[model samples]
Target: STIEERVKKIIGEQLGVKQEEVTNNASFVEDLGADSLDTVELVMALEEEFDTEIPDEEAEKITTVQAAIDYINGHQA
Candidate 1:
């Protein structure tokens, strides 16, 4: 799968939501039922999966699935 597809799968699995629900515009908190803690764990998973370090400040701004994809796409090693 593509990076975007993989990201949606991770978010869907982590948040216990269907992949279809994890749209690019969907908010992690508002749309996917993830709390702050969930978001943190999700970031950690992304970091591991993509082999990148998402800084705290940068992580805070990744609220949507598309944001995560964009950040990973920008920083992939």
Candidate 2:
């Protein structure tokens, strides 16, 4: 699967939701059932999965599935 698909699956699992619930337009808090702490965990998961360090502002910019994919793609080799 693509990075976007992988991101969606991780978000779904981390947030305790179905894969269908994660869309490009879904906000981490407003739509995906994620609180502030959940958002932190999501970033940590992305950083761990991609083996990169996500700066705080960068993490803030990544609040959706596609955003996570883009961040990882930019950071990954």
Candidate 3:
């Protein structure tokens, strides 16, 4: 399971993006207008996706799609 695609898929569901158009360039906070973009639920999704607990500071760093790929990159399940 590659981090990039899975993260994008999660975001697709997270923001209700069109399936084919789930681009990594999308920003949950900026582009998607997801005020729920931050905080527990979103971060928890990321956590459950990989079964890894993200640090509070690290969760704050994932402002964009690539940021999520990079963060989840090192976390192997």
Query: In lDDT terms, which candidate is top?
Result: 1
lDDT score for candidate 3 against the true structure: 0.55
Q: What is the C-alpha lDDT of each candidate?
A: 0.59, 0.56, 0.55
Q: Model 3, which residues run further than 4 Å from truth?
A: 1-5, 14-26, 31-34, 37-39, 56-60
Among all windows of 10 consecutive residues in model 3, the one with the lowest summed lDDT is 16-25
Predict model 2's lDDT versus the native.
Answer: 0.56
TM-scores of the candidates are 0.54, 0.50, 0.49
Q: What is the lDDT of residue 35 in candidate 2?
A: 71
Residue pairs in collision within model 2: none
Clashes of 3: 0
- Rank candidates, lDDT, best first: 1, 2, 3
Shift of residue 74 alpha carbon in model 3, Å: 2.7
| lDDT tens per residue, model 3, 1-77 | 24655576666465523234455445664554556536346556666666666664545566545456556776544
- The TM-score measured for candidate 2 stands at 0.50
Higher-TM-score candidate among 1 and 3? 1
Give the lowest summed-lDDT range of ten residues in model 2: 16-25
**lDDT per residue (tens digit) for residues 7-37 in model 2:** 6565657462334556544665446455776
Instruction: Report, for all candidates in order, the number of backbone clashes.
Output: 0, 0, 0
- Kindly provide the TM-score of model 1 when superposed on the true structure, using C-alpha atoms: 0.54
Residue 65 Cα positional deviation in candidate 2, in Å, after optimal superposition:
3.0
lDDT of 1 at 50: 74
lDDT of 2 at 2: 38
